[PDB]
Structures are given as structure tokens and as C-alpha cells.
């Protein structure tokens, strides 16, 4: 079988950089591999096949080369619609194997995050449910840890927590964090809280609030 | 007198891709005894009449094979298909006579008989009376081949199922075509 | 035209199975092989394999083997992936792609989305996010919770709101989706000037609008 090592998976950068992407083969492919690019949306387009051939309808800044078993894409200047997912495929051989893939992220400078905390709405406790919801806004990088806790111990249990893709504003990740309980396991506890850490401090960011307040 | 007795008669026909080619030349024969003759499934004549064939001329072409009982229609001036476009191919400025006839009794056997090949698989179509044996793997996708056979990487030639039991579409049928 | 046009969006239930198509038009059917690829949502491209429509010869991934098997049908021009004991490890996007003479995939179907679950249709609750309770700005949300299948769609006063606003991808919690949206505006304007996000379900017909109310 033949596996495609894709490096890296993730890259951060700036427009009108110089970028390259390696998809090392495990074993001789003779030049039979393929780019391709992938859209946030989801569209699919070839970018080269033959391992250096440019298909028609992709821009000049494109192109594909080969040292020994090491096949690179560069860029050589990178623009706006070029942040993108990115995978080589071999067809050398059945079955054809994808390269793992390459995000291309918006390179920006560090941000804290704005974190915001908010009780169950009256309308859910009705329902018989809680969730109690803690927003951590345009922050960067996309790593970022929450922890929740509840008269000062922490909870692991119960917590979801969704991200966005890049802000097309200012480049940004934001992250939802959600605490469920219960209406009578929210009504046996005073306070709540939300914690988050980030590489741009040591002492975590925290909000909180008192049941009934 | 004519060897068509050597044709028709013959134990064992070629496959249709290695199609046999016999010349006929300074001989007789009555070419209305074989038409009239209740041995023939097909005698279809293009570009003459089978009435005037006594009737006429030079040297005479015997091509001769065995294909499937529904693949008889491709042996005529103007058709498409497998046989027609990789096997073999009659002129549409043809003179001559396709016949045939059910050869189930002789080329079937209990199990199947698949010594009869025909060529499935090919980058070009045959020119008429064109006979291509050669046997190169067929890339039929981007995956390279390097002459081994594989997913995508097929050899040009298949065999027939021959089945006694088969339907009348799927039983060998022996053909001889005559050229003027 | 060269065109692969896959079938719509699909739901099934677990251990059931599925039947994807792939209508080719606008080249001869035989000529090309069509093969078939997988993603699941925020992961990479699996070949799953290829099919040769003239003979039907077909070539799979391992990890497809049994799971995934592919048809032909000249008749109709269109090519079939039946996925077979359906689980939610399933629930990915679905392509075919056209594996030409030469340079790979040419052409791509937009790709079919398959949801492999035992839910039934549910209308979201939707739930207001007022602070608790001052700074120049206010964060405000929206909780549209416990709903199927997706998609949602949440705007802000109708979606004149365009700016500092996150609506977040859905989470499966309890076999539904839970989505929530923020929006920060000046504490001048809220609560002064009305702020009302408009939830809408096409699944289940509905149209929620939930005005943020200042606690009490």
C-alpha cells in the first residue's frame, strides 16, 4: 500500500507569502500525484495532476514540483481566496490513497478573549432543563481550554463545547462553551462560573454569576 | 472444384479476433447448391445477388470464425459493436456473402467451452478486413499499467461462456464470409 | 457538458442501508471509471474505491470492504454505492468523481450528505441569553436547543444585525442539535432599541422570533 505523508497539517500565514506544502510517498509513484483544494464551502478543485502539470483555470502562483519522494505545492504569493484546505492524492497504484490534508490559516496577532456568561433563560427552567452558556470571543490562536465550575469545584460533566471557523472581519476564532443540567440540579447550587485560558495570560479569565440575582 | 468442403466443414473454427483468411482461385463451384442448401441459419449477400452468383467472375476470400448467435447482425457493410469495431469489419462498399449457421452441438460443452475469444477491449477501431492479434495489457484509467494486469489494467482478450442450455442469442454460431 | 449529478440529501436509520446514485451525462458512460470518496465533517478525503463501468470491475479501500459496494447501470448512465449496517461512524459527505485517461479526477458530483440516525423530526426550543447583570459594549445571545434534522438558520433583527455576530456550529447533545448565537452591541442601545433573534427550521416548518429582555 501506499502511504501519502502530508506536512504540515496546519499553516498559519500572511498574504503575499511564499508557502510549501509536502506530500512524501512511502514508496515510488513515478510523478502520478495530484493537488487538490478544497474551499471552507466544500468545493473540490484540481490545482495539478502529473505531479507538476497546471490544469487550466487555476492561477500562475500555483505550482508543483518533485526532489526524491517528496512532492511539494508552493505558493508563491499567497492571496485571500488561497486560505483553504489542501490534499495530495497518489493514483500509482489501486487503491489511490488522499495525503492527510493542510488547513491554511490567516496568520494575525494574539487576542485574548471576551468572555461572556449567561444563566438558564426562565422560558428553559419552565421545560424542566438548564443550560448555562459561556462565550469566549474573537480570540487567537484556536487554542483556548474552559473550565466550568460551580460554588468554587470544578464540573467536567455535562459541558459541549462548539468553534468558529475564522472571522472574515478581523481573523478571529470564537468558542461556545455549554454546561447542561437538570432544572432541579441547577436550583440545588448559588454560583456558576466559566474560566478560560489562553497563551496570552497565566491567570485565567473568569465570569460568574449567583442564581438568584 | 473448389475447397469449400475444407470451410464449411473444418473441426475446429477460429476465434473471431485471429479470424481465418483461405484464397480461393483457379477452381469451380456452384455457389447456388450452398444457397439453397438447408444447413444455413444466414446467407445474406451485400453489394451482388445470391440468385446471379453462378452467374459472375477473379480470386475469392473465405474469412471464418465463431461468435455468439446475437452478434451475426455486426457481421454486415454498416455496423457497430465489439465484434464489429475490435474483431472484425466488412467494407460498406462490400461484394460478397455472410453465412452462418448454429454451431451449439459442436461448440458448447456441458459446464461451458471458453476456448473461443474475442477481443472486449481496445484504444482504436479495426479497418475493414484488418486482423489485430496483438495482446497489450489496456490502461483504462489514469493508473499507469507496465504490463501487469490488474484493476484498470485489462487484457485485451475475453472468453466466450458457451453453454449447451443457453438461449439461441448466447450459442456459437459458425461464419463464413465470402469476398468477390 | 461533462456533469456528475448525485443524489439528494439522505437520511437512515442505524443497521439500516443506503443506495447513493451518480447520474453521468454529457460523455459515453463505459469510456471512464467512477469512483467514489468519503469525508465526515472537519476530517480529510478517503478513497473508498472505483468502479469500471463496461465490465463492472470494481476495486475497494480496505477499510470499505463489504461496507461500501459499488454498481454500474449503462441503461440509465449512473453509477451506485450501496452502504450496507448503517451507523452514525457513516454520517459523512459522499462524492464521485470521474477517473479519466489521464491526470486522475477531472470531474467531481457535488457530493450527497448522508445522516444515519434514529431522530425524529423536532422543532427547536428557542431561548433568550440576557446578561445577568455595565461596559461601552453587551454581549447578547440565543440558545436554539434540541432540534432535528439541521440546518437552522438565526439572524438578528431580521438580519439588519451584521456586525459582531457568531452564530456557533451545532453539537449533538441527547441524540438533537444545540446551536447558540451571540451578537455584542453598545449598552446605549440595549435595552433602549429592541434586539430579536429570528430562528427558522425548514424541516419542521417553523419561524421563532425571541426579543432579549433585560432580566428582572
Redesign the interface.
Do not use: C, H
Given at each position: 500500500d501506499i502511504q501519502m505523508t502530508q506536512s504540515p497539517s496546519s499553516l498559519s500565514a500572511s498574504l503575499g507569502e511564499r508557502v510549501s506544502l509536502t506530500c512524501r510517498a512511502s514508496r515510488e509513484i513515478?510523478g502520478?500525484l495530484?493537488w487538490?483544494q478544497?474551499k471552507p464551502d466544500?468545493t473540490?478543485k484540481?490545482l495539478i495532476?502529473?505531479a507538476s502539470?497546471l490544469?487550466s483555470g487555476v492561477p500562475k502562483r500555483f505550482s508543483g514540483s518533485r526532489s526524491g519522494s517528496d512532492y511539494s505545492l508552493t505558493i508563491s504569493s499567497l492571496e485571500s481566496e488561497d486560505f483553504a484546505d489542501y490534499?495530495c492524492?497518489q493514483?500509482?497504484?489501486?487503491?489511490?490513497?488522499?495525503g492527510?490534508?493542510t488547513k491554511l490559516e490567516i496568520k494575525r496577532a494574539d487576542a485574548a478573549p471576551?468572555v461572556?456568561?449567561?444563566?438558564?433563560?426562565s422560558?428553559?427552567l419552565t421545560?424542566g432543563?438548564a443550560?448555562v452558556?459561556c462565550?469566549l470571543?474573537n480570540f487567537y490562536p484556536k487554542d483556548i481550554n474552559v473550565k466550568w465550575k460551580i460554588d468554587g469545584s470544578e464540573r467536567q460533566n455535562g459541558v459541549?463545547?462548539?468553534?468558529?471557523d475564522q472571522?472574515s472581519?478581523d481573523s478571529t476564532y470564537?468558542?461556545?462553551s455549554?454546561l447542561?443540567l437538570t432544572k432541579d440540579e441547577y436550583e440545588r447550587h448559588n454560583s456558576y462560573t466559566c474560566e478560560a485560558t489562553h497563551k496570552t495570560s497565566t491567570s485565567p479569565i473568569v465570569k460568574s454569576?449567583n442564581r438568584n440575582? | 472444384l473448389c475447397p469449400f468442403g475444407e470451410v464449411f466443414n473444418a473441426t475446429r473454427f477460429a476465434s473471431v479476433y485471429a479470424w481465418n483468411r483461405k484464397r480461393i482461385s483457379n477452381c469451380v463451384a456452384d455457389y447456388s447448391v450452398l444457397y439453397n442448401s438447408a444447413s444455413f441459419s444466414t446467407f445474406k449477400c451485400y453489394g451482388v445477388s445470391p440468385t446471379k452468383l453462378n452467374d459472375l467472375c477473379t480470386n475469392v476470400y473465405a474469412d471464418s470464425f465463431v461468435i455468439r448467435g446475437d452478434e451475426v447482425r455486426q457481421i454486415a457493410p454498416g455496423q457497430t459493436g465489439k465484434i464489429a469495431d475490435y474483431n472484425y469489419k466488412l467494407p460498406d462498399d462490400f461484394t460478397g456473402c455472410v453465412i452462418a449457421w448454429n454451431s451449439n452441438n459442436l461448440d458448447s460443452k456441458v459446464g461451458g467451452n471458453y476456448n473461443y475469444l474475442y477481443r472486449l477491449f481496445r484504444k482504436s477501431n479495426l479497418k475493414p478486413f484488418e486482423r489485430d492479434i496483438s495482446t497489450e495489457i489496456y490502461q483504462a484509467g489514469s493508473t499507469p499499467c507496465n504490463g501487469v494486469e490488474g484493476f484498470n489494467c485489462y487484457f485485451p482478450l475475453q472468453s466466450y461462456g458457451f453453454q449447451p442450455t443457453n438461449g439461441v442469442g448466447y450459442q456459437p454460431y459458425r461464419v463464413v464470409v465470402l469476398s468477390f | 457538458q461533462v456533469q456528475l449529478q448525485q443524489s439528494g440529501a439522505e437520511l437512515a436509520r442505524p443497521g439500516a442501508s443506503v443506495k447513493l446514485s451518480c447520474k453521468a451525462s454529457g460523455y459515453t458512460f463505459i469510456s471512464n471509471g467512477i469512483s467514489w470518496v468519503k469525508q465526515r465533517t472537519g476530517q480529510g478525503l478517503e478513497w473508498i474505491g472505483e468502479i469500471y463501468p463496461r465490465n463492472g470491475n470494481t476495486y475497494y479501500n480496505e477499510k470499505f470492504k463489504g461496507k461500501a459496494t459499488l454498481t454500474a447501470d449503462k441503461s440509465s448512465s449512473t453509477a451506485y454505492m450501496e452502504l450496507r449496517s448503517l451507523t452514525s461512524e457513516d454520517s459523512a459527505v459522499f462524492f464521485c468523481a470521474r477517473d479519466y485517461y489521464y491526470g486522475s479526477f477531472d470531474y467531481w458530483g457535488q457530493g450527497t450528505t448522508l445522516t444515519v440516525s434514529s431522530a425524529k423530526t423536532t422543532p427547536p426550543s428557542v431561548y433568550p441569553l440576557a446578561p445577568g447583570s455595565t461596559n461601552s459594549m453587551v454581549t447578547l445571545g440565543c440558545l436554539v436547543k434540541g432540534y432535528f434534522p439541521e440546518p437552522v438558520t438565526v439572524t438578528w433583527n431580521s438580519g439588519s444585525l451584521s456586525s459582531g455576530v457568531h452564530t456557533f456550529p451545532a453539537v449533538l447533545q441527547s441524540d438533537l442539535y444545540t446551536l447558540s448565537s451571540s451578537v455584542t452591541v453598545p449598552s446605549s442601545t440595549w435595552p433602549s432599541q429592541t434586539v430579536t433573534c429570528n430562528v427558522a427550521h425548514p424541516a419542521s416548518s417553523t419561524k421563532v422570533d425571541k426579543k432579549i429582555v433585560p432580566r428582572d
Open positions: 513515478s502520478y495530484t487538490l478544497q466544500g473540490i484540481r495532476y502529473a502539470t490544469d490534499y492524492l493514483y500509482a497504484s489501486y487503491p489511490w490513497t488522499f492527510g490534508g471576551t461572556s456568561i449567561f444563566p438558564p433563560s422560558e428553559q421545560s432543563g443550560s452558556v462565550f470571543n459541549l463545547n462548539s468553534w468558529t472571522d472581519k470564537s468558542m461556545s455549554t447542561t454569576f440575582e | - | -
